[PDB]
Amino acid sequence: HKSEVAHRFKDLGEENFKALVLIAFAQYLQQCPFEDHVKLVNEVTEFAKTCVADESAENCDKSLHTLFGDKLCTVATLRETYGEMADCCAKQEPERNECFLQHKDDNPNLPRLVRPEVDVMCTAFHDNEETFLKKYLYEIARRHPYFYAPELLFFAKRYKAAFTECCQAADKAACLLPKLDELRDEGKASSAKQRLKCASLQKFGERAFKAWAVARLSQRFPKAEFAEVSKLVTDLTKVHTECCHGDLLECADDRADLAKYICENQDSISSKLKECCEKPLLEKSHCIAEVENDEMPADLPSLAADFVESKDVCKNYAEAKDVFLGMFLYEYARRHPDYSVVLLLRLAKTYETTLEKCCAAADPHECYAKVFDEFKPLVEEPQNLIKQNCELFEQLGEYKFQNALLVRYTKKVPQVSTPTLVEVSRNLGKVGSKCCKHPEAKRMPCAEDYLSVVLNQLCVLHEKTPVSDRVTKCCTESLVNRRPCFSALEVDETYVPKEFNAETFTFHADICTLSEKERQIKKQTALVELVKHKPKATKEQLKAVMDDFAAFVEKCCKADDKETCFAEEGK
Numbered sequence: 001h002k003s004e005v006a007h008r009f010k011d012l013g014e015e016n017f018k019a020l021v022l023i024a025f026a027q028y029l030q031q032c033p034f035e036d037h038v039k040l041v042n043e044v045t046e047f048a049k050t051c052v053a054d055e056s057a058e059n060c061d062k063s064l065h066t067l068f069g070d071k072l073c074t075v076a077t078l079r080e081t082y083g084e085m086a087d088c089c090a091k092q093e094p095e096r097n098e099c100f101l102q103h104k105d106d107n108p109n110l111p112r113l114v115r116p117e118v119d120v121m122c123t124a125f126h127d128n129e130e131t132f133l134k135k136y137l138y139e140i141a142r143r144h145p146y147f148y149a150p151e152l153l154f155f156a157k158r159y160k161a162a163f164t165e166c167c168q169a170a171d172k173a174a175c176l177l178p179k180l181d182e183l184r185d186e187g188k189a190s191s192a193k194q195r196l197k198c199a200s201l202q203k204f205g206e207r208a209f210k211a212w213a214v215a216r217l218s219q220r221f222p223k224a225e226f227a228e229v230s231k232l233v234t235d236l237t238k239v240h241t242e243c244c245h246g247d248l249l250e251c252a253d254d255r256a257d258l259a260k261y262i263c264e265n266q267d268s269i270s271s272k273l274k275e276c277c278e279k280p281l282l283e284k285s286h287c288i289a290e291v292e293n294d295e296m297p298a299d300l301p302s303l304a305a306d307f308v309e310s311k312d313v314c315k316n317y318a319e320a321k322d323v324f325l326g327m328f329l330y331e332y333a334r335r336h337p338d339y340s341v342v343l344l345l346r347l348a349k350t351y352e353t354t355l356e357k358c359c360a361a362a363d364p365h366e367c368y369a370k371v372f373d374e375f376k377p378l379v380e381e382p383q384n385l386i387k388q389n390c391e392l393f394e395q396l397g398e399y400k401f402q403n404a405l406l407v408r409y410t411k412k413v414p415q416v417s418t419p420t421l422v423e424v425s426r427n428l429g430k431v432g433s434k435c436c437k438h439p440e441a442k443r444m445p446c447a448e449d450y451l452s453v454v455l456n457q458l459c460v461l462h463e464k465t466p467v468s469d470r471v472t473k474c475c476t477e478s479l480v481n482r483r484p485c486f487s488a489l490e491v492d493e494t495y496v497p498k499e500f501n502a503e504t505f506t507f508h509a510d511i512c513t514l515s516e517k518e519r520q521i522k523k524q525t526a527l528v529e530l531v532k533h534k535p536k537a538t539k540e541q542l543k544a545v546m547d548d549f550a551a552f553v554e555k556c557c558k559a560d561d562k563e564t565c566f567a568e569e570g571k
């Protein structure tokens, strides 16, 4: 509009405005205290209200990137707390905003969020409800600087709903802790899922993201025509382009417009949207993003009639390559909800390479006649992977499957730091607990598309301080071949065994007071250090060392030896 901050304030309302601005500052300035961010948000909100009253007021005609960029450099502790980040304010937009994105720390070096007792949180929630929810938006945004901002507003609504219901219950802990544990897990998954959308945009461009969007939406909305799916992909690409670039006010506004358009044209998109569209606005967008795949229309013609057996295959492809390739991806994705997105991208990439060399010959039809037969090896390749990994997971359980994959990937890339290897390998085991129960119909889009997210975690956490060129090679190769690049890696022989440090294998009584999950990570951290020292150690001897450590921990926690049990286990 005329005043951009007034257009977003009037579309989103003050509540969502204040919350999104808070996320914005917390994602860029991740080290500043909570009190300093509230003043900026309130100063932005007071300034925004003056523009709603008069759009032609002072400073109201500036762009959102300019207004947000200027207020960022007003903090006196910018260069003393963030270092060289202040040097980037000497640039105009958008050259200034692009640097601020580079300084977002994916591992921001922040203490773990200790959760107070249930009676303490409930008293604080009743004292100041607005401040209590602001600290939740603040603490999550810092540790997740790319978190899907409109989706974070929804998590805050459920976080508020969990306390409103449970703090009046007779047994508050039995009510609240299950909801909080589920909210944290679903929030970590949402963070990692969105971190791949931004990496795909910031490292491979919109074309690679629109192809991903076309595939998944065609599996999800098979009844919709191509022009309808393309319209949704165009609107969805602009949303995540803004969210990943920090334009959180435009992202949540455009997402609400997109959610509203789908519901007013559901009969042209999908039949699974009747219930999702009867929810409040913030819940409406979340429901649509997780709706089931609609039933594809019955009696569909084969792709060979329009893409292999036609006198205008090369004619329509030459007239518009990406449009013709986008129709092939759409027609194939809608018919195959059992394929993963990344697989459909490989089949489209293969179909593209064939049309580039065959359409230049004199007999194109005889050249690309058997193009679909080249897809058989690509389809069976991830099925052998999932089948072998799920059989290994069903015979060990999640924890032993995590350790099995923890030793496997430590031997592949031993240079990666231990905290990064532990988190990634633990998440590589959670995909087994989530997908290996589905039948072979819905198992591939579950497993392989979640491996895309987890391996992206390895890429971003290694992108900061690279220590291994093997991860860099698989991360910057072609995005869609990331998993095959890692699944084909062998044990790194050029890695020299690390030095021996006894302080790493020394513990205290603090390990007994930790939770069972925190104890597993404490032990798995010691397992990664064991594999680095002896890369050629057999898996059975690695079990003999882990069986002694798993027994030594239980021995010292039961026996009240005043942690002298841990000190005596020195050698």
Ligand SMILES: O=C(O)CCCc1ccccc1
Binding pocket: 385, 386, 389, 390, 405, 428, 429, 431, 432, 447, 451, 486, 487
């Ligand atoms: O083999 C690898 O490289 C990692 C396999 C990870 C995986 C887990 C569960 C299902 C499928 C795959």
